[PDB]
C-alpha cells in the first residue's frame, strides 16, 4: 500500500474579525452580509462629537 486516505478533512482559510480602535456610538453600516468588500472601504461610522 502506497496511499493513505482520510474522510475527516475540511477546508480551512483565513477569517478576520473587525474591531474598533476607539469607543463610540454607531451611526451607519455599509455591509450587511454576503457582500463584497474591498480593502480600505468603510464598514462602520461613529458619532464624531467628542
Amino acid at each position: 500500500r502506497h496511499f493513505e486516505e482520510t474522510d475527516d478533512a475540511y477546508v480551512a482559510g483565513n477569517q478576520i474579525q473587525i474591531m474598533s480602535q476607539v469607543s463610540g456610538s454607531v451611526t451607519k453600516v455599509w455591509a450587511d452580509n454576503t457582500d463584497f468588500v474591498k480593502e480600505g472601504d468603510v464598514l462602520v461610522t461613529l458619532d464624531p462629537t467628542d
Binding site: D7, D8, Q15, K28, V29, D32, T34, F36, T49
Partner: protein, 98 residues
C-alpha cells in the same frame, strides 16, 4: 455564506474522548422576501418555513462582486445639536465681561 457555522464556533465540534463520526454539513443561504406581502401577513422571528428554490437557469454567479455607495442601516437620533450650549456660553461670557 463563506462559512458553515462551525467555522467560528468556540468549542470542539465533537468530544475529544469519543471517536469521530462523519456528519454532512449545512451552509446557510440568504433569501429576501417581498415587502407587500409582509405588511398584510406579517411574520415573527424564528418561525419555521418550507423553502423551494428554482435552479433551472444557471448563469454562473456564485459570489457577488458589486460594491454599493449607499449605507444599509443609518440612524441619527443620537446626534445632539449644540445651539443652546452655544447660547448659554455667549450669555455667560457677556455676563462676566464687565
Amino acid at each position: 455564506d463563506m462559512g458553515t457555522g462551525s467555522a467560528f464556533s468556540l468549542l470542539p465540534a465533537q468530544n475529544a474522548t469519543g471517536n469521530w463520526i462523519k456528519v454532512v454539513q449545512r451552509l446557510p443561504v440568504r433569501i429576501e422576501l417581498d415587502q407587500k406581502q409582509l405588511e398584510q401577513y406579517p411574520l415573527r422571528i424564528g418561525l419555521s418555513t418550507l423553502v423551494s428554490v428554482n435552479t433551472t437557469n444557471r448563469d454562473g454567479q456564485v459570489l457577488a462582486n458589486k460594491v454599493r455607495s449607499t449605507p444599509v442601516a443609518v440612524s441619527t437620533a443620537r446626534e445632539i445639536s449644540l445651539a443652546p450650549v452655544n447660547k448659554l456660553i455667549d450669555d455667560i461670557v457677556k455676563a462676566n465681561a464687565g
